[PDB]
């Protein structure tokens, strides 16, 4: 279909196509999947994405974009099952921070409204279907539940709209197939209630049968035209007056065909059944022999010319063998030369390479690759210099030129212009040490990050940074509580470490990653694990405090922005000022003979410390900055 599409060759295929790609079929299947699996992510959004749930006479593009943002939301917040049909609105925050608690911005309200508005047209038809379905006991009342589901979502009207849209675009066949899908489904249901209408069956058996039915569904045969290449088979196809015949895939195991015996009755079952005087269909043994007659009819079908082709390799590169028929043909025609079929024209004669230029696209495609080969110091055919030249003569050579610009393709980045840079990053650059570190790792990464502000799709999943934030915030809460009860880290008992730690993690849990620690039992245990960690760390800090002359001054101290310490600042050739604002984990002061002493402590989740090599290349700057 695709090749003859590209080579502009009209064809008639002797076979019916599947409906398994049609939106209606998938709509029904995925809907039943929503019911069966209790609104799992994949099922629901398969269903939504078939677009049949879309609000009637609303612009599908805009609806799509809304669904898209709902989908990202569901992924990020882990929405599934009861949460869909709960009364509660989906709540939306652009960013949630553990340390600081924030009131909902106005943009967030606008978003939340959109999300919930989209949800409110998704849920009812699906919810009502689920309700009707639990209540329906017999095949007929489940079939009626389902059909009503189709009726209420205005499926026939939407499909008819689709028919017209397609017809306008000229796609007559693709338009014709919508009504086929509908009639097919209706017939399926009709039969089902005809044979089992009054029988009570389970939802699982129902879905199973509906699925089995939809798997067999096929569109009608596209009616033959006045001038088509005929593409068909060797067992059932019949032709007349054929001038030329291509026999394909003459591979071992393929031609002749290995029959599959497997049915209720075995080959030996059938063979014995013959001796007792009962005649059935041909067992595999016979069919394997009749393959010779099939191949005979296939070979003597044309009047003028006959081609017998075979591929040597798989799509995956697995080796395919030529059948016995190729050898047999080599015997009957020992002076006949075998022709090579490749997408590498260099491997054939110039006359054959000339066969490749059949139209502008095919020509463009092959020419570009031939040009590449040429740059690699290889003599490409004259056919391609001729072809290139005609392509450059033709009306829209700019397109062909663009295609051929691959010859000089390099992964180059153009430096940001002064005005663009100024607008993107600002005349004043507010930064963090981490931003600088990112830049020193790779400028482009910093560009995608802090320039374009490209965000990755959020997932309902506890990553490392979230846990880090949890640890930081937890130690902060503990420290604060310690000062509020006139207690010091030294005076902590094991009991107190445990109590405080568990309380702190308890406090912070509902704020951490969309309440993921409350999401399941497994995550409850994750929460307990984290509690145990914080406990031991509390104890450790208590022991370190009893042996250190250094006293913590400020924890999670802020320099720049809101924080008490002023931002360090830099002046540029640009005239721009770069101020950097950040947060030091801990600072300790001590009293000594040399004077007042200050040290910086950072809570990390790795054993590794500070590598001066990484400092020299600007990969590790946070600590020395804090000290500075």
């Amino acid at each position: 279909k695709e090749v003859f599409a590209d080579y502009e060759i009209p064809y008639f295929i002797d076979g019916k196509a599947s409906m398994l790609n049609h939106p209606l079929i998938e709509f029904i299947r995925s809907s039943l999947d929503v019911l069966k699996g209790n609104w799992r992510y994949e099922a629901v959004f398969r269903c939504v994405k078939t677009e049949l749930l879309f609000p009637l006479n609303e612009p599908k593009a805009k609806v799509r974009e809304q669904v898209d943002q709902l989908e990202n939301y569901c992924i990020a917040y882990g929405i599934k099952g009861d949460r869909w049909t709960k009364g509660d609105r989906f709540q939306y925050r652009r960013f949630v921070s553990l340390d600081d608690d924030f009131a909902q911005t106005d943009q967030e309200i606008e978003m939340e409204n959109m999300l919930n508005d989209t949800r409110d047209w998704i849920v009812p038809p699906l919810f009502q279907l689920q309700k009707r379905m639990k209540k329906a006991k017999t095949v007929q009342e489940k079939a009626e539940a389902l059909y009503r589901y189709l009726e209420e979502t205005d499926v026939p009207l939407k499909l008819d709209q689709e028919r017209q849209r397609a017809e306008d675009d000229g796609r007559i066949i693709e338009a014709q197939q919508h009504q086929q899908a509908w009639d097919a489904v209706i017939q399926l249901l009709e039969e089902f209630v005809e044979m089992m209408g009054d029988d009570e069956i389970s939802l699982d058996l129902f879905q199973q049968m509906i699925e089995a039915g939809a798997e067999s569904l096929t569109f009608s045969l596209i009616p033959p035209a006045l001038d088509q290449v005929f593409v068909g088979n060797m067992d059932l196809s019949r032709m007349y007056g054929t001038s030329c015949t291509f026999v394909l895939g003459a591979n071992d195991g393929v031609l002749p065909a290995r029959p599959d015996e497997n049915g209720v009755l075995s080959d030996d079952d059938r063979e014995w059944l013959k001796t007792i005087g009962v005649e059935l269909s041909s067992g595999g043994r016979e069919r394997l022999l009749d393959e010779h007659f099939l191949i005979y009819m296939a070979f003597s079908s044309p009047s003028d010319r006959l081609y017998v082709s075979y591929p040597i390799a798989d799509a995956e590169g697995k080796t395919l063998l030529p059948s016995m028929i190729v050898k047999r043909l080599e015997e009957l025609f020992p002076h006949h030369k075998e022709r090579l079929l490749t997408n590498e024209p260099e491997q054939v004669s110039d006359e054959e390479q000339l066969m490749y230029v059949v139209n502008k696209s095919v020509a463009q495609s092959f020419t570009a690759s031939q040009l590449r080969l040429w740059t690699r110091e290889y003599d490409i055919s004259d056919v391609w210099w001729s072809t290139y030249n005609v392509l450059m003569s033709e009306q829209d050579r700019l397109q062909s030129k663009k295609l051929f610009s691959s010859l000089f393709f390099r992964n180059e980045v153009k430096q940001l212009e002064r005005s663009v840079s100024r607008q993107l990053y600002g005349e004043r650059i507010q930064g963090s040490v981490s931003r600088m570190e990112t830049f020193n790792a790779c400028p482009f990464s910093h560009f995608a990050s802090h320039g374009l502000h490209l965000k990755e799709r959020q997932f309902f999943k506890l990553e490392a940074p979230d846990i880090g934030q949890l640890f930081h915030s937890s130690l902060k809460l503990i420290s604060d509580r310690l000062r509020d009860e006139k207690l010091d880290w030294r005076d902590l008992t094991k009991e107190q470490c445990e109590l405080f730690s568990y309380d702190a993690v308890e406090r912070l849990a509902p704020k951490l990653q969309k309440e993921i620690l409350l999401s399941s039992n497994r995550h409850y245990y994750v929460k307990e694990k984290l509690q145990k960690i914080v406990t031991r760390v509390s104890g450790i800090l208590s022991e370190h405090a009893k042996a250190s002359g250094f006293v913590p001054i400020g924890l999670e101290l802020g320099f720049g922005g809101k924080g008490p310490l002023p931002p360090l600042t830099f002046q540029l050739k640009n005239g721009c000022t770069m101020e950097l604002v950040g947060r030091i984990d801990r600072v300790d002061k001590a009293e000594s003979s040399k004077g007042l002493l200050l040290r910086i402590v950072a809570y990390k989740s790795s054993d590794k410390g500070l590598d001066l090599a990484e400092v020299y290349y600007g990969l590790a700057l946070q600590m020395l900055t804090y000290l500075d």
Partner: protein
């Protein structure tokens, strides 16, 4: 030209036959000819479908099929009259020559009903099945956490980290998988507890696992003893230190004191941590030898380290403490066993529901089908097994040394009877077993070798083949020299004795060239130097043609690249190598299993797919934008961001499109892309992922584009298999863009991967980079073996737990509350045992690698320092025996640690060893020596291409190309025109049955009327009641349904016959009804621009009535049209309109009768039931 032994194997019958022999003995050839002989026999003929041949690979099966077919043909040329041989040539497609998996598949397909399997089952994709497994593991874990049993938490705490439980997940998976390599997985799982069923009173030495402890101790103490003896020998040397002898002799005594107590673990606990070596007696003087002086101390310290290692391993805790720890761990193991069992039952239930099976389910379900009764490991054959026993006269197995217990069970059930008189033929070689990582059991082979006798009386017969017919003597001697020193007992699991040595049997004309070469290499990658060296020597082989001898043909051929083969142990190094060889200009082909999603083309094409799925993904969007598909540059990208900073990138793109002006280039890029995006998004809703991918390709020309950039061949291959992979996944379980993308993402997240597509097919002239494992059973003229200086992967040892086929689950003692852990005894035993087994197999891998070659063998390995390593090589090579020291071989981490010392005693680097007929050419390369720009020729054409202007002048094919590109099909216009057309068409959503008012459809009434009108007698005008008697004649014969019968105006029917035209019909010379017809009409009439050469359209129809009076031939039609009800002038309003409504139809009908019968029709009548009106046309 068969050897006597070979022929013995080819003809021998009556009993199970094992054929054991080294590499290149013709085992596979023997097997083939045994098959041939069996079938093509005058004395007793058997059909090919009466044999079961189980090969290791599908390729081997196909190869067998052909090597057979050809022999059948030769036999046929010699004997044309043969009916049988002729039939055999046909049966070859019905033949059971395959892998065991394929046979299992046939078994499941035929006997599905014997187990709980759907006949329409399918084998799941590797990742697909693994995903299903992952899901049920998640469900199971959630259920256990929910239940909250103390035992479960006791398990989790011990085998997970401090913040997540993923390691337990992996643990369950690993244990289940390992258990599946046994015929009875559950039973093997339930045998776990027995290892932990000990007490403080238990006797360590009597426990199974202690075997491996015993040997270890025996090996290290002796390993130190010998190490001291050498030091003692170094005291006797002239330059050697004499005073330190009394030190060594003391140490020896102490170590000997331990040797007398090897058997008693308790006594060793008492003595081993109590051993102390007296301070090294300093030797001062220049009569000694500083080198030797400082070397003896190294040996002594070696003894020290060995002892300390032994101590820390076994004797830092009392045996009672060890046993207490072990016993303590018992409840945790029992929980683990139960968890893994639940997993399996659940995993199977999941796969059952989706009607799919594992790759692993093949074996086990087959085995299930073949057994009827199973008693403690004794399997009684079921009906299926009897069938396959009777159908197969003999069962042939190649590569039997890599059979596993499950497969062996299946073989034992399909083969006929006991060993003594069975039909099991098997060939293989223990030395070549390389699949123990897949839990294959070469011991299966070995036990059968030991039980069998050459006589084969009362038992099965073994047959040895001594001769090698594959390779030159240089290879055989090099191999044999190396492996007499390496493979023996604890390392190798096999004696490399005279019977196992390779013996020359192939006739090869001489060569100075065929010397086996060893290349040792001393801000650049080591892999690059290795690749450079390889390429260099390859070029040397090409510059002066190496001569390739065809042993069977006895004819030479110039050296081709397809003759050179590079073998690697692991493929991490392969990419860099391929790059380097291409830099040198050599053609390379390597079958890859990874790196697909790292290809930029794949990343971008995927990004397009994701964007079509959900545009609100900033990074995939930006990726597609910056890609050559759109071509936005960094300024254009930042320009897009500027329109909207806070919003998603997609929104910003939308906004720039909204505010931008058509004059700008960026707007045109973005507008075109967006138009395309919307097209594709709509497209995805009623087309497959595959159709979508091809459409994206032809809309973006992205495949075309990448085919013209560096590495283009590969890139186009990648995008191609993206399409094909999509087709496979669509066909199977992931139909549609969303499901497909999800599947790809889920796959990637796992850590799974796909391989890069192969640009060139195998049959082409290229140098193949393959793993040593892929190499088995094959032979190649020239063979490289690189990465020899590389370490062995032994990460398995390092984990807190270990799995063992014999012993089960060994673990550390772990206390989650106390925060302490330490290895239990069976863990250390299993560790030592595993190191042994692993080392032995790596040796077999090396053996396979070296035996692959025919004429040339290259060994390239790298090292830090030549002289240091040479010194160490010598240190391990001072022994007078052929076999190197057991402990030294035990300490090997790299292949060079084997090859090195074995190559040290050779002359090229004891006369029996030194003088061996093995020739080794040693090159001591350094990086700098390998390290070793061209003419700048400008090209007018290149820059002309850059400009977009053509190439200067007048090529041969200019004219023809011009002709073809402007060509258009003559009959283009009629290529879409449907041939068959409807008479109604030329003029040019329903509810289910159970939702409607029953009966009386409007059209149904008309159709009913039609049927009576055509079945009514036309002899005379009937009465009103007469027509009704006609109707229950019709109802009875079911021509009309009674529903249709109930709705009929009998008066309306009768009335037509009163009319004058109807009167003419009854009083007609001739009459006929329901006359179908087909009519050809030139396409031009229906469609303008059509042509006479262009075929006619076919128009079919049914004529209601035709009658012939004396005057002429008349046409008659009936319409159940509605007239009286709704027309202002009634029928007279209707009459002009009705004539219009059917005018075209009637003109077509008349054209039909006029053309076909060639008789003009005088008049045509339309009878309308409503009002009884008759309109004349």
């Amino acid at each position: 030209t068969w050897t006597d032994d070979q022929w013995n194997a080819i003809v021998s019958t009556g009993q199970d036959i094992l054929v054991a022999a080294a590499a290149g003995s013709g085992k596979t050839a023997v097997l083939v000819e045994r098959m041939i002989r069996k079938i093509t026999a005058e004395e007793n003929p058997i059909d090919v479908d009466r044999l079961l041949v189980v090969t290791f690979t599908n390729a081997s099966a196909a190869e067998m099929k052909h090597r057979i077919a050809e022999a059948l043909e030769k036999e046929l040329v010699q004997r044309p009259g043969s009916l049988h041989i002729r039939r055999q040539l046909s049966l070859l497609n019905r033949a059971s020559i395959s892998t065991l998996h394929s046979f299992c598949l046939q078994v499941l397909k035929k006997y599905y009903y014997l187990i709980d399997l759907d006949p329409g089952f399918r084998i799941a994709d590797q990742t697909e099945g693994e995903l299903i497994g992952d899901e049920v593991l998640d469900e199971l874990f959630e259920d256990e956490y929910a239940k909250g049993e103390k035992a479960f938490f006791e398990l989790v705490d011990r085998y997970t980290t401090d913040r997540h439980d993923l390691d337990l997940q992996f643990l369950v998976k690993q244990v289940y998988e390992y258990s599946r390599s046994h015929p009875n997985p559950e039973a093997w799982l339930e045998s776990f507890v027995h290892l932990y069923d000990v007490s403080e009173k238990s006797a360590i030495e009597e426990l199974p696992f202690y075997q491996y402890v015993k040997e270890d101790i025996a090996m290290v103490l002796n390993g130190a003893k010998e190490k001291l003896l050498r030091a003692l020998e170094l005291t006797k040397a002239p330059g050697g230190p004499a005073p330190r002898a009394d030190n060594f002799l003391d140490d020896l005594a102490q170590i000997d004191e331990l040797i007398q107590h090897q058997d008693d673990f308790s006594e060793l606990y008492k003595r081993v941590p109590a051993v102390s070596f007296k301070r090294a007696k300093a030797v001062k003087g220049d009569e000694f030898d500083p080198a030797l002086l400082d070397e003896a101390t190294d040996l002594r310290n070696g003894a020290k380290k060995l002892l300390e290692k032994l101590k820390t391993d076994y004797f830092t805790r009392s045996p009672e403490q060890h046993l207490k720890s072990l016993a303590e761990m018992k409840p945790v193991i029992e929980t683990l066993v139960q968890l893994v069992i639940s997993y399996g039952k659940r995993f199977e239930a999941a796969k059952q529901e989706k009607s799919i099976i594992d790759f692993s389910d093949l074996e086990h379900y087959c085995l299930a089908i073949l057994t009827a009764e199973n008693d403690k490991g004794e399997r009684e054959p079921s009906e299926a097994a009897r069938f396959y026993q009777e159908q197969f006269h003999e069962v042939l197995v190649d590569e039997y040394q890599d059979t596993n217990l499950v497969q062996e069970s299946i073989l034992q059930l399909v083969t006929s009877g006991p060993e003594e008189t069975g039909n099991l033929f098997m060939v293989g070689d223990v030395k070549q077993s390389i699949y123990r990582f897949r839990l294959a059991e070469p011991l299966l082979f070995l036990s059968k070798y030991k039980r069998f006798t050459e006589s084969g009386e009362g038992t099965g017969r073994k047959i040895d083949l001594n001769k090698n017919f594959r390779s030159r003597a240089d290879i055989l001697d090099s191999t044999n020299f190396l492996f007499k020193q390496l493979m023996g007992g604890k390392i190798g699991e096999v004696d490399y004795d005279e019977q196992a040595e390779l013996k020359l049997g192939a006739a090869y004309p001489d060569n100075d060239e065929t010397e086996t070469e060893l290349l040792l290499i001393d801000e650049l990658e080591t892999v690059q130097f290795e690749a450079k060296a390889i390429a260099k020597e390859i070029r040397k082989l090409i510059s002066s043609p190496f001569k390739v001898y065809d042993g069977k043909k006895k004819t030479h051929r110039n050296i081709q690249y397809r003759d050179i083969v590079i073998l690697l142990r692991s493929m991490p190094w392969a990419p860099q190598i391929m790059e380097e060889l291409r830099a040198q200009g050599i053609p390379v082909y390597a079958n890859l299993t990874s790196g697909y999603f790292e290809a930029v083309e794949v990343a971008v094409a995927l990004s397009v797919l994701k964007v079509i799925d959900n545009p609100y993904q900033d990074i995939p969007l930006a990726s597609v934008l910056r890609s050559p598909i759109v071509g936005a540059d960094e300024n254009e990208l930042s320009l897009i961001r500027l329109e909207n900073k806070k919003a998603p990138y997609y929104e910003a793109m939308k906004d720039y499109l909204a505010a931008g002006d058509r004059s700008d280039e960026l707007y045109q890029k973005l507008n075109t892309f967006y138009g395309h995006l919307q097209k594709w998004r709509a497209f995805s809703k009623n087309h497959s992922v595959s159709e979508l991918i091809w459409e994206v390709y032809r809309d973006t020309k992205y495949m075309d584009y990448v085919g013209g950039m560096p590495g283009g061949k590969q890139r186009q291959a990648n995008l191609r298999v993206l399409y094909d992979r999509a087709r496979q996944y669509e066909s199977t379980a992931f139909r549609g863009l969303f499901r497909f993308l999800r599947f790809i993402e889920r796959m990637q997240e796992r850590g799974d991967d796909l391989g890069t597509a192969r640009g060139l097919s195998e049959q082409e002239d290229v140098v193949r980079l393959m793993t040593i494992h892929s190499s088995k059973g094959l032979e190649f003229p020239v063979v490289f073996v690189a990465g020899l200086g590389r370490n062995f992967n032994m990460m398995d040892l390092n984990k807190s737990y270990l799995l063992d086929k014999e012993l089960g689950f060994g673990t550390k003692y772990i206390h989650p509350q106390l925060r302490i852990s330490y290895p239990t005894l069976p863990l250390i035993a299993m560790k030592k045992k595993m190191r042994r087994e692993l080392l032995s197999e790596e040796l077999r891998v090396l053996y396979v690698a070296l035996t692959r070659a025919k004429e040339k063998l290259f060994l390239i390995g790298s090292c830090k320092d030549h002289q240091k390593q040479l010194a160490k090589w010598q240190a391990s090579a001072s022994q007078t025996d052929w076999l190197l020291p057991e402990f030294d071989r035990y300490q090997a981490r790299t292949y060079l640690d084997f090859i090195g010392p074995a190559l040290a005693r050779h002359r090229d680097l004891h006369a029996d060893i030194s003088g061996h007929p093995a020739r080794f050419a040693v090159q001591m390369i350094h990086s700098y020596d390998l390290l070793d720009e061209r003419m700048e020729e400008k090209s007018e054409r290149l820059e002309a291409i850059r400009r977009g202007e053509p190439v200067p002048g007048s090529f041969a094919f200019d004219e023809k190309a011009r002709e073809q590109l402007s060509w258009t099909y003559p009959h283009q216009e009629v290529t879409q025109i449907r041939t068959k057309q409807s008479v109604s068409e030329i003029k040019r959503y329903r509810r289910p049955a159970f939702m409607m008012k029953k009966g009386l459809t409007a059209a149904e009434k008309g159709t009913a009327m039609h049927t009576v009108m055509q079945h009514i007698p036309l002899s005379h005008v009937p009465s009103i009641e007469e027509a009704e008697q006609t109707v229950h004649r019709l109802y009875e014969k079911e021509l009309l349904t009674e529903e249709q019968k109930d709705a009929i105006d009998i008066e309306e029917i009768v009335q037509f016959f009163h009319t004058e035209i109807g009167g003419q019909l009854i009083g007609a010379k001739w009459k006929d009804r329901e006359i179908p017809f087909s009519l050809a009409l030139p396409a031009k009439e229906i469609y303008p621009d059509a042509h006479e050469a262009d075929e006619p359209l076919l128009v079919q129809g049914i004529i209601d009535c035709l009658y012939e009076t004396e005057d002429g031939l008349y046409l008659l039609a009936y319409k159940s049209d509605r007239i009286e009800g709704k027309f202002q002038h009634g029928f007279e309003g209707a009459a002009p309109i009705l004539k219009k409504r059917y005018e075209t139809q009637i003109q077509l009908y008349t054209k039909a009768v006029e053309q076909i019968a060639k008789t003009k029709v005088k008049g045509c009548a339309l009878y309308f039931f409503d009002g009884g009106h008759i309109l004349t046309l």
